[PDB]
Amino acid sequence: AEQIEEVARTVPGVASALAFRLEGGRYINVEINREKAARYGMTVADVQLF
Amino acid sequence: MNAWLQLNTASEPMLLIPSQALIDTGSEQRVITVDADGRFVPKRVAVFQASQ
Predict the structure, then answer these.
(1) 3-state secondary structure chain B
(2) In a 3-state reduction of DSSP, which class is residue B18?
(3) CA distance B24 to B47
(4) In terms of C-beta distances under 8 Å and separation of at least 24 residues, what long-range contacts does B7-13 make, across chains too?
(5) Residue B23 to residue A22: CA distance in whole angstroms
(6) Is the torsion defined by CA of B51, B46, B26, B36 positive or negative?
(7) Measured between alpha carbons, how far is B11 from B19 in angstroms, rounded to an integer?
(8) What is the CA radius of gyration of chain A?
(9) Which candidate, B18, B16, B45, B15, places its Cα nearest to that of B31?
(10) Measured distance between the N- and C-terminal CA atoms of chain B, rounded to whole angstroms
């Protein structure tokens, strides 16, 4: 779409993308370390409960 | 019997702003400044640590 918008404003008619309308969500990612968790005996699922 | 110990620790002297002030998008750290005239101008900062 990004690269199509580039070839969109180069042909009779106005244009606009969409990849930007569909953004802005904010996140806090808990990325479990399997090796770290394993040490304490916890499995991916166990950590996820908290 | 149980006992709860709350700890307070002094840190390195740093620039201090409220947490509601810091906007974090996981790539840029910004805060909206209120310029002299009243002109809201965003500025990029570098976070250290936070609490309280």
Answers:
(1) CCCCCCCCCCCCCCCCCCHHHCEECCCCEEEEEECCCCCEEEEECCCCCCCC
(2) coil
(3) 9
(4) B11/B49, B12/B48
(5) 20
(6) positive
(7) 17
(8) 22
(9) B45
(10) 28
